[PDB]
Amino acid sequence: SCTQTHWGQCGGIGYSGCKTCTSGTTCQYSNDYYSQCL
């Protein structure tokens, strides 16, 4: 699993593995399927 960039979908039950947002960013929730690195 990648070290996921700033602005990066962890949420989506479909996405290519990586949830771990890079230093400064954590995966901030909006929807279940749209949770994004911010």
UniProtKB/Swiss-Prot annotation:
It comes from the Eukaryota. Transmembrane segments: none annotated. It is found in: Secreted. Disulfide bonds join C2-C18, C10-C27, C21-C37. Residues 2-38 form the CBM1 domain. Belongs to the glycosyl hydrolase 7 (cellulase C) family. Endoglucanase (EG) that cleaves the internal beta-1,4-glucosidic bonds in cellulose. The degradation of cellulose involves an interplay between different cellulolytic enzymes. Hydrolysis starts with EGs, which cut internal glycosidic linkages to reduce the polymerization degree of the substrate and creates new chain ends for exocellobiohydrolases (CBHs). The CBH release the disaccharide cellobiose from the non-reducing end of the cellulose polymer chain. Finally, beta-1,4-glucosidases hydrolyze the cellobiose and other short cello-oligosaccharides into glucose units. This is Endoglucanase EG-1. It comes from Hypocrea jecorina.
